[PDB]
Amino acid sequence: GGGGILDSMVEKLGKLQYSLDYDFQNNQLLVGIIQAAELPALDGTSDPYVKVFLLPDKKKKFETKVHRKTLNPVFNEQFTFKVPYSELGGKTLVMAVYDFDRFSKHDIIGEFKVPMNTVDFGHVTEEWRDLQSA
């Protein structure tokens, strides 16, 4: 009654652990794409990879390596965004997990966003985030 409330709940599409730190010495944002867990199987298991990028920036998106046939990949990758601190406040970091497929569109598994204006810089941020439907 009931069903409508269940439909509003966050779907079980897995989670991604990432870390974030602004390097004030070099003036760049550092992002760690650590691992994902409990991904749904779209293939069976999926072939997950993560796209990492800033909005509204129109720059080419960074991507992790593809991890074949796993619902619990460990990426252990780091990415760097050369952006002065004063300009970072208006941007939003996006992390999106996709299922690599060689013969068809890569299905999105889920994504989430981290507005830079609500992040506590000066201390390394690390958290698990539930992937949201795209």
Residues 16-45 that bind Mn ion (CB under 5 A): 43
Residue 68 or 113: the one with the smaller Cβ distance to Mn ion is 68
> CB of residue 16 vs Mn ion: minimum separation in angstroms?
17
CA distance 96 to 62: 11
Distance of alpha carbon 73 from alpha carbon 132, whole angstroms: 18
Burial bucket for residue 99 (CB in 10 Å: 0-12, 13-18, 19+): buried
The rounded distance, in Å, linking the Cα atoms of 108 and 122 is: 32
43 is in an annotated binding site: yes
One of 23, 101, 126, 127 touching Mn ion (CB under 5 A):
101
Which listed range, 1-9, 59-67, 101-109, 124-132, lies at the site for Mn ion (CB under 5 A)? 101-109
Q: Minimum CB separation from Mn ion for residue 47, in Å? A: 4
How far apart CA 127 and CA 129 sit, in angstroms, is 6
According to CB under 5 A, which residues from 44 to 63 bind Mn ion?
Answer: 47
* Binding region for Mn ion (CB under 5 A): 43, 47, 99, 101
